[PDB]
């Protein structure tokens, strides 16, 4: 009885994990770098996430792949062991916290439509990116500092974190790298649902007010009613609609003061084609916001879902004393790769819902770059 040979698994992983990861993230980086249209603040998150996922595919996965074909033994120099473990925890944690930063960033966009200057957005973006990387470095730093337990005649050292030396880090590190942002994203999810629901209402409320007052105006016999039902209505591109409407209200009110109801009611008629222009525009944005938020929700949920097996089994392998550790480890060795896949192809799947990105990709796969 023997372990056997796992060459076919290695081949499989090279085919359906590493290549997808590298190719996908490369495409995203190329897209953002080449396309002028795509060079705005919020896409710099994506580029930062892409690099993180790209580096996992270049430096982390192939070593993880080596360790699979040479047992617990560590063929590389010992010094590269804590380094590989550092980069692994670093990049993996970064990809998760990146999605949390995007989630919250997108919520604030919906809630606070104003204050969206690109000039500020770029700086603010960079700051956020840097914070995410700082949080990642923070979470990953215990590994190299603690070091690995160290030889007789040869070196029989296995490159792995032990439950005796890193049980806490595994527990609190898991809490820090996965469950915290998960909670944050859940809260953000519900805040976003509430935000949109709230947004939809106020619009219908103002529609109602306008319609009601216009109804009052169009049936008015005297001037007092017209003048009365006009002040109630009086309550860069954003302020333009305000100036226009308020201007028209004042124009009609100026006629109402004159006592020319026939003129005012006619001026009020023009307000219909005016409200229909801004209500139909404002009511259109929330639709896109809703569709977008739904897509991001599903996609991000799938990402989070594919990481559960690892961190849950991780904490269980630490806490559960009665559980069979052999099977738990055997499971972990798979769940690690399921996680690698998750983070590996995430940015691509996400950006594939954008026509610009998607077209760019289509042009890049045929090797045009023009
Ligand atoms: C804070 C900003 C105020 C949001 C608000 O204007 O609130 C408005 C709105 C309530 O009407 O908020 C909501 O809808 C309620 C959202 C809160 C949902 C609670 C999530 C539970 C957290 C689980 C994490 C693990 C513990
Ligand atoms: C994907 N990556 C995997 C990586 C890892 O397990 N690397 C080793 C080398 O591989 C193991 O899984 C092997 C395979 C099967 C048996 N193994 C183990 O038992 C122990 C896990 C363990 C240690 C102590 C106690 C319980 C379990 N392994 C290891 O140390 C650690 C990560 C991590 C740990 C803590 C916080 C984190 N945030 C992000 C991450 C991360 C990224 C995340
Ligand atoms: C695993 C080892 C043996 C080989 C792995 C090589 C990988 C990195 C190769 C295989 C297929 C290659 C991709 C094939 C096609 C494209 C589209 C092109 O417009 C830019 C690069 C890109 C995205 C390549 C990036 C590198 C790539 C993903
Ligand atoms: C084993 C020791 C660990 C390291 C082993 C590495 C093995 C990687 C194998 C193939 C490299 C292929 C290189 C492909 C790099 C693509 C980067 C790319 O071109 O994207 C940059 C961007 O497009 C520009 O703006
Ligand atoms: C900005 C950084 C923010 C939080 C970093 C929190 C770091 C969390 C990592 C702590 C790991 C830990 O304390 O492990 C102790 C050691 O393993 C013996 O128990
Ligand atoms: C599992 C825990 C139970 C409820 C999950 C509720 C769904 C939480 C899925 C989070 C995905 C997310 O990031 O949502 C961002 C939000 O949609 C910004 O647009
Ligand atoms: C080893 C396989 C490497 C395969 C690399 C396939 C993509 C390389 C590529 O298309 O490069 C574009 C060219 O350099 C435009 O100047
Ligand atoms: C994009 C499609 C995703 C590709 C699927 C890749 C998922 C990886 C699956 C399992 C890898 C197994 C590696 C561990 C070796 C032992 C395998 C075993 O005993 O079953
Ligand atoms: C240490 C980590 C290095 C990560 C570099 C950050 C890339 C940001 C992309 C812009
Ligand atoms: C405003 C918020 C300012 C940013 C600071 C937030 C981070 C504060 C503390 C993080 C909690 C981590 C506890 C320290 C762990 C030390 C250790 O054991 O490694």
Swiss-Prot record:
Effect of residue 85 to A: No effect on agonist binding
Residues spanning the membrane: 10-32, 44-66, 83-104, 125-145, 169-191, 295-315, 331-352
Effect of residue 161 to A: No effect on agonist binding. Strongly increases dissociation of bound lysergic acid diethylamine, without affecting binding affinity
Keywords: Behavior, Cell membrane, Disulfide bond, G-protein coupled receptor, Glycoprotein, Lipoprotein, Membrane, Palmitate, Receptor, Synapse, Synaptosome, Transducer, Transmembrane, Transmembrane helix
Residues given in the record as ergotamine binding sites: 88, 93, 161
Ranges in the topological domain labelled Cytoplasmic: 33-43, 105-124
Principal cellular location given in the protein's record: membrane
Impact reported for residue 177 to G/S: Does not affect agonist binding
Functional note: G-protein coupled receptor for 5-hydroxytryptamine (serotonin). Also functions as a receptor for various ergot alkaloid derivatives and psychoactive substances. Ligand binding causes a conformation change that triggers signaling via guanine nucleotide-binding proteins (G proteins) and modulates the activity of downstream effectors.
Annotated protein name in UniProt: 5-hydroxytryptamine receptor 2B
Lineage: Eukaryota, Metazoa, Chordata, Craniata, Vertebrata
Residues of the full protein shown: 48 to 400 of 481
